[PDB]
Copies of this chain bind each other. A is one copy, B any other.
Amino acid sequence: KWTYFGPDGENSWSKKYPSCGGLLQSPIDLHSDILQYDASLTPLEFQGYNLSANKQFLLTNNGHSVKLNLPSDMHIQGLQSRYSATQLHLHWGNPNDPHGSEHTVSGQHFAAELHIVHYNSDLYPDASTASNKSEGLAVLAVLIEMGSFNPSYDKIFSHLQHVKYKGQEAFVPGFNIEELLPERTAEYYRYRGSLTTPPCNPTVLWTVFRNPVQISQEQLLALETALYCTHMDDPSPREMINNFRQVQKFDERLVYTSFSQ
């Protein structure tokens, strides 16, 4: 139902999904007036990110993004509970405007954004259960800029022509997910927010890394042209483009940084 364009687009999500009009919404613009250094923001540790190349992981077009399912043995160490991986996915723009990150920095969009979604597996037996509970989810966000070809991201992008339509699934060999993260992961922004898609649950601890990664113009164009929101047999196809939400009012929140300058 919900979309990023037209009558069912983001200003209407709250009609069906009340949390979309509630507090603590994401994404946000990261800018100086709302940043505050917090020396207690110690480095995360990425455990079991190096997935075996002999195993395979399900890539699915869900009608809104492309998502890779991740195993629960993959987890973040360093939060106040263990958060185990559940899936990663992307947000992007379109061929004529490759500026589709969700978070912005000092008012500017990056080309795209990767989210790696984790859930509190100490407390909950699955991400769905966790998704509507306080600090149930932790998402890592990587800002993506147009730059050099990125062989690691291509381990995902080379399979897109196989998940072109809603409901389609493909298998991706395992690779080291840490290769999708930027330099100096110890430098990040941290804030309490929400899912950026319906149902917009305000249950996410966000970590946005300070530094972007690069993928090429050709890899952005492939991501921006490969996928459809609709099923393979739909007589009204809709391209999966511009699948990012506008930034949200801050509502008195600060964003805490692990870097001072």
Contacts and interface: CB of A to CB of B under 8 A. Distances in A.
Nearest to A252: B96
Contacts of A252: 96
Given A4-B249, A251-B97, A12 B9 contact: no
A154 to B, nearest CB: 26
Interface size class, chain A = 35 or more
A157 interface: no
Nearest to A17: B11
Interface stretch (A18-26, A77-85, A175-183, A230-238): A18-26
Residue among A6, A11, A104 facing the most chain B CB atoms (10 A cut-off): A11
Interface stretch (A40-48, A68-76, A105-113, A219-227): A105-113
| This chain: copies in complex | 2
A184 interface: no
Given A107-B106, A242-B251, A97 B34 contact: yes
B97 A249 contact: no
A134 interface: no
Nearest to A34: B97
A97 B250 contact: yes
A97 B28 CA distance: 14
A23 B7 CA distance: 8
Residue among A14, A96, A106 facing the most chain B CB atoms (10 A cut-off): A14
Nearest to A94: B251
Contacts of A242: 249, 251
A242 B29 CA distance: 15
Contact of A25 (B11, B98, B107, B247): B11
Interface of A: 4-7, 9-15, 20-23, 25, 29, 33-34, 94, 96-99, 104, 106-109, 242, 246-252
Which 5 pairs show the lowest CB-CB distances between chains A and B? A107-B107, A12-B21, A11-B21, A33-B97, A11-B14
